[PDB]
Every structure is written in structure tokens, then in C-alpha cells.
């Protein structure tokens, strides 16, 4: 803002003609002076990093996860790399921990058990590096919800949405009532899924479910024992039994 | 896609003769006789019906 | 698991193989479309002999 | 040869036949936009500026 | 007959129906003009927009 006759108050940019105009007097003060935007072996540093991101791509390809999740996974690492406080630690664990975080950051965590499937790192070391990263990057996290895993597991069982949704309510009602103040929510969820599957024609054995969730077959049985007292009332009001709650098996 | 309302050359109203034209070809008429039973006597107004392809009946197959 | 192969449309391995016109219209597809091309990143690619 | 306006590969055409739908057509065109996070602060978003 | 004066035309004109097509090259797409427009930054040569 300036003019020879007055100190300019406003200088509009006319992108269309590519002109600078000062309306309150009438004199282009700038002419053709505003561009309009409109609309390997050589690598030494960021080389082991680049390999880790190729290996990050590999880990996220074994699960075929969207690029947006990986985009922040790469950014998380770059950040973790830059501070270098945690520089003296295994890169693949950090990559895997970055991966667990991004899923949570996308509101869709994947179990360490799952994360272990795609990496050599022990769940313990991933959890250690995880803590270190939380401390390293100074950022908070979120608590898990059962429903976030209702989708793929029921999918893996090819269970219809109605069973899937029924399980979610059963799970949701159970946690609101804290019917299971101990067992992991996934363990609790699987039993709900089991109960749900046991409330539909799509019944499955605990071992198969246990095999899919990875939890112990006794842990589901225990978790089942905890939810069974309320099996009938835990179901959603919009449900169609294939087996009476009375006829729900015991184990 | 749909029968025009007016012949492009004369201006005579054609858009009300498509269902009657199909109805005459339905029974036994030849295209030469059905066009005479409707009163189209210039060869510019007969081209209108003789060479019309009705695409609107195939866009009504897609659910709205 | 190894990888993923593109699929030429209307082949024996497509989801449109051996369908009737009442179902081809139900998936919003043209019954007159010939097939024989790939769909790669939205685009439609064709291979030249 | 009528008035000389159709010489050397041209055509004269009826104006009051164009007004009844002759050779009228339409024209479509599509535009893409994609919001992207190319950076932490360099994040994009659809909103009314 | 002539359309302006109603007189007959001495020759007889060959007339009949034919099948024409409308090509894709329209004139709304090929007209453009420049008069003191935006210029580049490094070499200060006229640039598009
Ligand atoms: Zn001024
Ligand atoms: Zn006519």
C-alpha cells in the first residue's frame, strides 16, 4: 500500500487481466509484477530411512492399507528420525509402532498381534518403542472400541450386518454396564460375536472365532461366562432369534 | 430420442403421429400405406417418421 | 498371496460374465458395450495389437 | 449456386429449421479436485474462504 | 422459385434428401485473442493464463 498522492488503503489483485489496481484514486502502481498462481547408491542420509519407508510400504501392503494412513506413518517416522532422541533403536520396530499409531490416528487401530503378523518385532518391543514415541513426539492417543473390529472379523466370517450390528449392541450394552471389568474388549467382543453368531444360523465354534481373534479359547469361554447371565437382555430390540436365549449353549 | 414436434422443413405438426404409426404397422400395413393413411404426402414429412429411432424407450430401463 | 492382476471387462473372470440384459441394466451398464478393455485408475485403456 | 456464400467448400443452411431442433446438441465436461495432506501444516480442506 | 423476387430460376436444380453429420470442431472453441496480457517472471516474455 502506497501512492504518490495518498498512502494506499487497498491494492486489489486482478488475476484476470493480471493487473494491480488502486481503486480509491485510479493508478496501476505495479505493472506485469504480480504473477498469478490461479488454479540409491548416492544417498547416504535418508537412505536407510528410504529403505525403512520401502519396508513401511511393504508392511502396509501385507494388509493393503490406504495411502493416507501410510502418508502420516512416513511423516511420523521422519519426525521420529529428526529428533533422533530414539535414534539408537531398531528402525523396523519404530516403523511398526508408527503403523499402530496411524491406525489409531485414523480411528481404526490394528492389533499388535496383527502388527506382529507383518513384522519380526515382539509385541513387547513394539509397545516399548510405542511408549518412547508417545514420549518422543509428545502426543496423546485414544481408547479402543469393540465396534471398530466388528466389521472385518464378521466380514472374515462373512456374517450378515444384522448379526454384526447385533453383536455391536451386545458389546456396547455390555461395556456401558461394565459387565466385564477385566477381559480385553476384543475378547469381550469375540464372545459377543460368538453369542450373536450363536443367536443366528451362522453359528461358529469358539476355536474358529478364537483362531480369527487370536485370543485363547478359554478366554472367550471365560468372557462368555461373564456375558451369559445377560445373554437375553444384551441383544438389540431389533433382532430375530435363530435359537432361544434359553437354548444358548454353556461353556 | 423422442419424436420431434414439427417437421424441420415444412413446419407441419408430426409429434402426435408416432403412436398411430406404430399401431398401423402393428396390424398388416406397409410403411408406404401407413404413411398415406395419416396424410403425409410430401417426401420431407415422410422422412420424419420413416427414419426415426426411438431412444427414449431404452433410458426408462435405468431406475431413477 | 502374491499380487493382483488387472481384468479385461466381459471376460470369463469378470463380474459381468454371462449376465442378461435385465441385470446389466441393474448395475448401470450398457447392454451394447462390447468390452475388451481395462480400467486402470479410472481410465479405460486398450491394448494395440 | 444461390448468393455466393457457399463457394469454396461452404454450405448455406436454413435458419428457421435450426429453430425447430435441427442439429442441436449438448456438451458436458467434468472437473476433479482432491483434498490432500502433503504436509502437517500444509493441509487442505473444502471450505468457504 | 427464387425466394427474394418470386421469379422462376432458368435452370432446374437437383434436390433430394441426404444424410449429414455434425463434426466435433465447433467455432466456440477456437477463437482467442491477446492484448497486453500477463508475462513471465524470469525472461519477461508473454505468458498464458
Ligand atoms: Zn491509491
Ligand atoms: Zn414437411
From TrEMBL, chain D:
<comment type="function">
    <text>DNA-dependent RNA polymerase catalyzes the transcription of DNA into RNA using the four ribonucleoside triphosphates as substrates.</text>
</comment>
<comment type="function">
    <text>RNA-dependent RNA polymerase that catalyzes the extension of a non-coding RNA (ncRNA) at the 3'-end using the four ribonucleoside triphosphates as substrates. An internal ncRNA sequence near the 3'-end serves as a template in a single-round Pol II-mediated RNA polymerization reaction. May decrease the stability of ncRNAs that repress Pol II-mediated gene transcription.</text>
</comment>
<protein>
    <recommendedName>
        <fullName>DNA-directed RNA polymerase subunit beta</fullName>
    </recommendedName>
</protein>
<comment type="similarity">
    <text>Belongs to the RNA polymerase beta chain family.</text>
</comment>
